Amino acid sequence: FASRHGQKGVIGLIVPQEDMPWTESGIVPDLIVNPHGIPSRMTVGQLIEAIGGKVASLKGRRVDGTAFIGEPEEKLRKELEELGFKHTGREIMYDGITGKRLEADIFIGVIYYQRLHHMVADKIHARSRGPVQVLTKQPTEGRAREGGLRFGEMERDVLVGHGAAMLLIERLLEESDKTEVWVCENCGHIALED
Amino acid sequence: FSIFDHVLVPEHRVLSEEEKKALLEKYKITLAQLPQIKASDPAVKALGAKPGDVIEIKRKSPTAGVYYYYRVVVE
Amino acid sequence: EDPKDPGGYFIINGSERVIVSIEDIAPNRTLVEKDERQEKYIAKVFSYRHGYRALVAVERRKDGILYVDIPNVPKPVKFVYVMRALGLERDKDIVEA
Amino acid sequence: PPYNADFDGDEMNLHVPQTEEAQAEARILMEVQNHIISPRYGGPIIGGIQDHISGGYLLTREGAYFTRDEVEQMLMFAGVDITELPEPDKYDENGNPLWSGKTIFSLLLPEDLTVWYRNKLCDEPERCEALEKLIEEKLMPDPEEVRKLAYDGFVYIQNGKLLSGAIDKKAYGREDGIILDLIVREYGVERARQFLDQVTKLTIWVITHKGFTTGIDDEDLPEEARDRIREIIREAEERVNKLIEAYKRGELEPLPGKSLEDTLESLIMAVLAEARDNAGAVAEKYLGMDNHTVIMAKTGARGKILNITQMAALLGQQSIRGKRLYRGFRGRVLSHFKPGDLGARAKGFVVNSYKSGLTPQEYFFHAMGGREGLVDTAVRTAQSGYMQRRLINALQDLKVEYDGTVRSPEGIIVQFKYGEDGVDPMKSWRGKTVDVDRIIVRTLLKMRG
Amino acid sequence: AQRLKGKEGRFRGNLSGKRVNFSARTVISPDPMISINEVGVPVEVAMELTVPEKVTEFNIERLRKMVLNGPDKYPG
Amino acid sequence: VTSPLDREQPHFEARDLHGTHWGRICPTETPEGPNCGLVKNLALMAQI
Amino acid sequence: MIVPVRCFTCGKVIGDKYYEFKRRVEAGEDPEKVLDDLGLERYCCRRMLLSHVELIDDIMHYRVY
Amino acid sequence: VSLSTIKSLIEKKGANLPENVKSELYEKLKKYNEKYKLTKAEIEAIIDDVVKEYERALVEPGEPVGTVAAQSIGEPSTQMTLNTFHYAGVAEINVTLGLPRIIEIVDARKNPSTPMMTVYLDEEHRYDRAKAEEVARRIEGTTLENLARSTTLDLINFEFIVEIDPERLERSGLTMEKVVKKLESSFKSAEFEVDGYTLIVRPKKADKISDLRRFAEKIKKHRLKGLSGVGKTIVRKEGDEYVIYTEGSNFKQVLKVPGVDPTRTRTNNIHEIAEVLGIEAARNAIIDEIVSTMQEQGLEVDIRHIMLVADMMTLDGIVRPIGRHGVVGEKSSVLARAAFEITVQHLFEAAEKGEVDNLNGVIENVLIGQPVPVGTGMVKLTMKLPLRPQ
Amino acid sequence: KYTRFEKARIIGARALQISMGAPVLIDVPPGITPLEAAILEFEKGVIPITVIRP
Amino acid sequence: VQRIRQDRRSGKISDVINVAYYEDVKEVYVNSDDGRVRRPLIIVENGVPKLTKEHVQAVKEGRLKWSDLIKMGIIEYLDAEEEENAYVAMWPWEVTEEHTHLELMPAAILGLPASLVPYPEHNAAPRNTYGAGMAKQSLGLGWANFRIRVDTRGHLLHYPQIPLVNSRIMKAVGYEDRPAGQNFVVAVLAYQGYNMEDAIIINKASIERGLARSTFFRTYEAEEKKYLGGQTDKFEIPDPTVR
Ligand SMILES: [Mg+2]
Ligand SMILES: [Zn+2]
Ligand SMILES: [Zn+2]
């Protein structure tokens, strides 16, 4: 899920409704986001849109958010106070588990969010044995044809750096390709088995 | 002015036969398996050495106060 | 069809193909740059006729002598020489041109 | 942190070893708790991040107190095998008992740990100096004497009892972790794993049930601060204009080795950087410790002071490749300025903050600034990858022999003692071959006890 | 000459690295309730990947129970 | 609007946002990876 | 594509009130007064009626059998 | 206890410790004993604890330190910047930094992009500002075109004409008659007319239509005074000692200039230190350069990996690059070199020479599919067969 | 005494021996896997494999 | 250049002609070729814009169109060459005698997806770029024709909604008729450890009531090829005999 201010993420947990905290005015959040990404990302526009959405939904008409001529922040803050809420956009909530109000006032608003086409149902992929390519006799490529994941040379260097020789040989021979050949030690050439 | 007074240049000295053989025995190495120093190196000129000789270098590394590095002279 | 569809694309074997716009250098433009590697000054033009492109350049090397580069020419020819090849052989004509 | 992963769409692969020897290698060599200390610099790589540090600060800050139910629930949630609560720290009105955050946090530390240092929250060096003097005069101070001089900027632990200071990125954050670094070395990997799990869960519970948020009013500066910032900006702009006027009549002093134009540019940039720093100086001083954004920034959990001074006070100069913006029309960046204008505003100086909004010219200059960072990362990744591949192919097959020497596969000796002291950087005490001070101090406190 | 050169060539594409069996790939999500040395695995992946195990005198009953569970119950 | 250059090279001069781009090319809508700065989109005021 | 039956957050049924709101707001009556008349106090419900767009009417023209 | 007893105890049972460790332990024990009275048993226990920590901190045999060092250098390289600072600040000279500097050092470029030297004055002129300026004047070098306020290629009479600037004179205490004297000493049959902030040159060949400009530039480019290659110089104070930074580089000549402290002068060109001071000084310079470059970016990297890289590069008595024309190119294994770059050329060259690959490395063994000789791949095991259960 | 490489190698050899049919030298809880059986034998000190060092 | 400008504004010559002069080199450039990128601007004459209030009224009432404004000499297109000689003011209230043109709408310098972000000047540029890029990946009722479309892949959001805070450009461009998202009641709070490092937490009841519920489409294709020599494929139930 991603907002239009560049903030993106994945669903980490699905919470039952009675566990979610509720504002003392009767609002239950549809979504909860971490307050930690906001200062680093420096997306103040999302914080302004949060106020603007609730102001629009409370006054009954949409709010213009044009680039350089949209409704200023100070107008929205005063209008929110006019409607009976606090100008900071902070409301008192009660904890959904212990049933008692949180110590700090919580910023809550309405934000436009978009569902992206990167769904886990299309990304999950696992290969037990699968088929193999004709030439190199190695696992195929891609989810569509039961392919195997690429084990890059950087991974091999990581394995070497850990010193795991037997893990490396296991990953590199049995799982991908291995065979037995006849070698004539007299001349080194590969012998023929009839 | 000699290069040995510079802070970047450690102290070089020539190993005679006895310590050369002892060093070669303690690491179980032939003379060809040592780090090489050119006969055209300024330190080789200043100290005075011939090809096939072994130079002991006392380094002043930060990890260990004194560390001994050995190089074989080659033209 | 959807009335909101803007059009402006092609349908080839049932697939929708759209041609993006390439951003080229303006044709028949004399652009001057510094060849500091060989300490020269170069002017470049891209002459177009019937789609064909020809990169023609005139340069001044360290010697102060002008040389002209022409497509399908192995080494740059003398500027006065190639101008002479186009008639206008009079030296005063060169100086006035 | 070891995986450099964030949950914004990242995908990570999983492999299953198929043979018993491979499983044994993975189990013994590659366990996560084995690699708490990074081999690059001998410091922790696994540690608390973001909410862990923030919750630790909330728990261990001065004035924090908790009730019976909160203490029991948080201890049960953390997984601590406690069966009897300690003595209450203070009694609330109506007779309710209260427990301080220090007492609760002390139940996770090993019973005999002792350490003291200075954290990132140090702001009044006299307070820390007094505590250092008290500890130095006698290596075992009286706890009831330390608690009178307790200050959030100086962490001090006595026999597992946290007596002063507050949790910070220096406590168990990966870069500056000390408690975790001491535990992993003095008690083995398993105790460190247990400690890490318990502290993470405890801090998560604290931050969940205390409430932690940021809002649009976190950058609401008072009017006097805005007036001061505008004064600073106007003074800087006037200085730049005076410099340009002096330059235009040949009265400027040419700085050594530089062209006159370059001297003018360098002086202008110095003035503008000084102006932005001066604005940030008051922007920081007017936002106190009670602001959640300031808490997030000062403790090192997320962000830094530059983000705050950009959001609240001033964006400052925008530049590409270390020089002011010049890639526009002839003699001007945008057609909305007169040609030949060298003023600060006309070359990229943005006087607004993200909160107050950017005028279109400032917005265009900011986009110009951001594009350089985007392309810089894009090219730098490939260049670093190629250089690392060359290094890997160069140094792949070197190893430590049984005699201690590092030898090429052809038998050539590269080093007669690995690292010239023989100490593995991962096992080193932060680069140092051995930490003499820590050993002496811990031995003395052990025996003097 | 083309087969033996490049990132997709033999030496760097099929010798120094290759595609492997018994591997899975999916997105990650946070979970603070598990220990640092543990990873949460989907039940769909767990029933697809297998770990060959030999029958011994100390694990016969568990393997027998799993064989009885078949390839559809989770511990099968 | 797509530049015909090679993506792999740095091309620091070509990927930069020129001052004349005002009102002719969007300053923000650009790809993320190696195509950053080489693929661009016309602004709304643009006319060809 | 059609008006949802209940508000996503609280669950109050607001599926029947969309057409009434649209008609009254078109007639000229103040949208906030219309919403308050309908009994939608919490703004979670008011958002659902204010931001909804009717899109069933322009997809009905294409049929698949 | 007495300090002599402590010193004897440290060398008695802590004899295995590195020298810096034995000295640091003595210093710390001496410092602590006066503040807190230490007993004999406490000293013995402290020494035993230090020895135990050193024993448990040693490297495990079979550790693949090379790959770890390569990764510990490569990984921070994704965090460094490219644009550096590009600021002058009067007292500083612009030089390449960040990732390009590291690439330059590792590749051991023959001539760096921004050569720079740090010149330390001898005890004389070291602390005096004016005397340091005089020494810089001795070091600093210039040509004729720099001194020119303006230049006139007069064509009516075909004479070179130069307009002279007072500031270029006063930068060094140089005066016009000195410039004229060097002009007359370094060339013959040229006018070199002496005029107030003006000089005219008109030999017989330049007097005609063909040989004015070409000889004019040759005259214009001549140096009258100063060390060759040192374009600029800047003086600033570090601590209580003044030092000199220079544009360009000529390490050979600076060590002979009077007033310079030759025991402490450095240059950022590795191939100069190698030729002037030897291979070990080049190794130390490489280590210091890498340490400073990575430190300026705020990144923390342990010195040991840098020591490994430096020792690997400075191994054959020269300063080889890390790459195709260096350490990788010196590898004996054919397959190890082939897998890196230019595979076909290496394969055909090996076919010509009849080279033999002994599969002694890691890459070749991985290619074959047999255990590598690192980590657990070098351990050998034995057991006594008649095992009876208990 | 033991390097972690030696410990890993010894445990890997013991686990493979146990899986191939070698008897366990110590009593183990039922249902355990051969790798855990080898690890148990190890920390209990009953190891019949020794390491060669030059 | 003044003579040509007068004819171009009056209507004597085509509007595609652009003229600029360079004083230093004494050169005059006339451009009439194909492929130049231009922007419209209001002509400012003697410190007074040529656009008047009654012109705006006529445009609003539908009496006067944009092409008429072009032909009336009120608005002209400027390419890069001609803009070198211009001096454009940003806002009507900052126009003076020096200015030669007036900006129509500064907010329109952004691209089409970039116009979606509300209050874009309050975000850092990289974040705006990420948002503009991601705006092209979200689900929604892309086209009303989707049911009979034969695209390889497709999506359909069940309950798309109009953004409550939006730019007036999006209504003009027709985006509001085809929205691609929904309005969420969002609370900024560290609810647990399950939302750290940019993870988000969502309510179960709202999901069960039809929040962000979507449908995925995929089209398969099968040809009954006719080979050389008369052999051909056939649609049928495969008999057990066939290999
Ligand atoms: Mg990510
Ligand atoms: Zn044979
Ligand atoms: Zn509702």
UniProtKB/Swiss-Prot annotation, chain B:
The gene is rpo5. Keywords: Cytoplasm, DNA-directed RNA polymerase, Nucleotidyltransferase, Transcription, Transferase. DNA-dependent RNA polymerase (RNAP) catalyzes the transcription of DNA into RNA using the four ribonucleoside triphosphates as substrates. Gene3D superfamilies: RPB5-like RNA polymerase subunit. This is DNA-directed RNA polymerase subunit Rpo5. It is an enzyme of class 2 (transferase). It comes from Pyrococcus furiosus (strain ATCC 43587 / DSM 3638 / JCM 8422 / Vc1). One of its GO terms (cellular component) is DNA-directed RNA polymerase complex. Part of the RNA polymerase complex. The keyword Nucleotide-binding does not apply. HAMAP family: RNApol_Rpo5_RPB5. One of its GO terms (biological process) is tRNA transcription by RNA polymerase III.
Swiss-Prot record, chain G:
SUPFAM superfamilies: RNA polymerase subunit RPB10 (SSF46924). It is an enzyme of class 2 (transferase). It catalyses: RNA(n) + a ribonucleoside 5'-triphosphate = RNA(n+1) + diphosphate. The keyword S-adenosyl-L-methionine does not apply. It is found in: Cytoplasm. Its cofactor is Zn(2+). Pfam families: RNA_pol_N. GO terms for molecular function: DNA binding; DNA-directed RNA polymerase activity; zinc ion binding. Its main location: cytoplasm. It comes from the Archaea. InterPro entries: RNA_pol_su_RPB10, RNA_pol_suN_Zn-BS, RPABC5/Rpb10. Its EC number is 2.7.7.6. Binds 1 zinc ion. Zn(2+) binds at residues 7, 10, 44-45. GO terms for biological process: DNA-templated transcription. Keywords: Cytoplasm, DNA-directed RNA polymerase, Metal-binding, Nucleotidyltransferase, Transcription, Transferase, Zinc. GO terms for cellular component: cytoplasm; DNA-directed RNA polymerase complex. NCBIfam families: PRK04016.1. Part of the RNA polymerase complex. HAMAP family: RNApol_arch_Rpo10 (MF_00250). Belongs to the archaeal Rpo10/eukaryotic RPB10 RNA polymerase subunit family. DNA-dependent RNA polymerase (RNAP) catalyzes the transcription of DNA into RNA using the four ribonucleoside triphosphates as substrates. This is DNA-directed RNA polymerase subunit Rpo10.
UniProtKB/Swiss-Prot annotation, chain H:
InterPro entries: DNA-dir_RpoC_beta_prime (IPR045867), RNA_pol_Rpb1_5 (IPR007081), RPO1C (IPR012757). Its EC number is 2.7.7.6. GO terms for biological process: DNA-templated transcription. Keywords: Cytoplasm, DNA-binding, DNA-directed RNA polymerase, Nucleotidyltransferase, Transcription, Transferase. One of its GO terms (molecular function) is DNA binding. DNA-dependent RNA polymerase (RNAP) catalyzes the transcription of DNA into RNA using the four ribonucleoside triphosphates as substrates. Forms part of the jaw domain. Part of the RNA polymerase complex. An artificial construct of the RNAP clamp domain (including part of this protein) contacts transcription elongation factors Spt4 and Spt5. This is DNA-directed RNA polymerase subunit Rpo1C. It comes from Pyrococcus furiosus (strain ATCC 43587 / DSM 3638 / JCM 8422 / Vc1).
Swiss-Prot record, chain I:
It comes from the Archaea. The gene is rpo6. It catalyses: RNA(n) + a ribonucleoside 5'-triphosphate = RNA(n+1) + diphosphate. Its main location: cytoplasm. The keyword Chaperone does not apply. Gene3D superfamilies: 3.90.940.10. One of its GO terms (cellular component) is DNA-directed RNA polymerase complex. This is DNA-directed RNA polymerase subunit Rpo6. Its EC number is 2.7.7.6.
